[PDB]
């Protein structure tokens, strides 16, 4: 496959930094006026990571409709993702309101609450069955239903209830707990196994609203997850591991949210994942068992 030729030639000449810088230079720049309004300062985790106005998710409140979240709509792949920052202590209600209004079935969390000894995300889901959470501002109730903990990720079944209406929904929470503080995993196997666990759940499927994906800023690891998934989908649709250009798909996604893929490392790991994942896509269904 042509992607494996490119990977090996970029590696051979140690120009990943150069390739990645090129992507930074060519990436879209759109306005983020609403994110930057004074009233929204405390709704943003990082001053340098903002949703573009044109693709931002709007909350359906007439109060303040702002949340730091972007709709990434991949037209050809026929997949949509919402990428958002890790909820702040004051934005957990907004987060779950978005999940509700967007009709999402899955939340994919790619960070730990604490990394590098600092808090990266608020504790926005309940950790015990008997202690549900109520978000008074958005009138939603959230209850931990079950939790399946594996060595490198955890899946939880949550019940989200709209207290206004009393309709309830099941949300699946996919928590990848072993993406390293620095660098990236040496093997994409754990990551791919995770992604396919999300896929098998139905969470990425067209019957539902777009999956919600976040890490701390919602661009690095979040970008890696969506990039790999979309690339594998395009390869599957076309059955042509050669026609799928990962740098172009990445640039396409960056039309919808800035900064997707934060380091040359994450770029290289993205190639790694797509290359290894394409073995499964192309008819070798046994590679999933070895992941």
How would you describe the overall organization of this protein?
By secondary structure, the chain is of the alpha/beta class. It has a single domain (1-291), classed as Protein-Tyrosine Phosphatase, Chain A, CATH 3.90.190.10. Helices cover 33% and strands 22% of the residues. The protein contains nine helices and eleven strands. The strands form two sheets. A nine-stranded mixed sheet has the order 1-2-3-11-4-10-9-8-7, with helices on both faces. Helix 2 (16-26) crosses helix 8 (264-281) and helix 6 packs parallel to helix 8. It is globular, with a radius of gyration of 19 Å.
Can you summarize this structure?
Helix content is 33%, strand content 22%. It is an alpha/beta fold and 291 residues long. Its EC number is 3.1.3.48.
CATH superfamily: Protein tyrosine phosphatase superfamily
CATH class: Alpha Beta
Task: From the 3D structure, determine the CATH topology.
Answer: Protein-Tyrosine Phosphatase, Chain A
Biggest β-sheet: strands ordered side by side in the sheet? 1-2-3-11-4-10-9-8-7
What sort of overall outline do the alpha carbons produce when their principal axes are compared? globular
Structural class: alpha/beta
Overall number of structural domains: 1
Q: Would you count the extended β strands for me?
A: 11
């Amino acid at each position: 496959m042509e992607m494996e030729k490119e990977f090996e030639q970029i590696d051979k000449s140690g120009s990943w930094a150069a390739i990645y810088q090129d992507i930074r230079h060519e990436a879209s720049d759109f306005p983020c006026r609403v994110a930057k309004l004074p009233k929204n300062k405390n709704r943003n985790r990082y001053r340098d990571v903002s949703p573009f106005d044109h693709s931002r998710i709007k909350l359906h409140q007439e109060d303040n409709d702002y949340i730091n979240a972007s709709l990434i709509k991949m037209e050809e792949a026929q997949r949509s993702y919402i990428l958002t920052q890790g909820p702040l202590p004051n934005t957990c209600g907004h987060f779950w309101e978005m999940v509700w209004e967007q009709k999402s079935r899955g939340v994919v969390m790619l960070n730990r609450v604490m990394e590098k000894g600092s808090l990266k995300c608020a504790q926005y889901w309940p950790q015990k069955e008997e202690k549900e959470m109520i978000f008074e501002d958005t009138n939603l109730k959230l209850t931990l239903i079950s939790e399946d903990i594996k060595s490198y990720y955890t899946v939880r079944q949550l019940e989200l209830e709209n207290l206004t209406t009393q309709e309830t929904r099941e949300i699946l929470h996919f928590h990848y707990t072993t993406f390293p503080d620095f660098g990236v995993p040496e093997s994409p196997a754990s990551f791919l196994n995770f992604l396919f666990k999300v896929r098998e759940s139905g969470s990425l499927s067209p019957e539902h609203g777009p999956v919600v994906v976040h890490c701390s800023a919602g661009i690095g690891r979040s970008g890696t997850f969506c990039l790999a998934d979309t690339c594998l989908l395009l390869m599957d649709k076309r059955k042509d591991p050669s026609s799928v250009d990962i740098k172009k798909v990445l640039l396409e996604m960056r039309k919808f949210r800035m900064g997707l893929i934060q380091t040359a490392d994450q770029l290289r790991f993205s190639y790694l994942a797509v290359i290894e994942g394409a073995k499964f896509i192309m008819g070798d269904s046994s590679v999933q068992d070895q992941w």
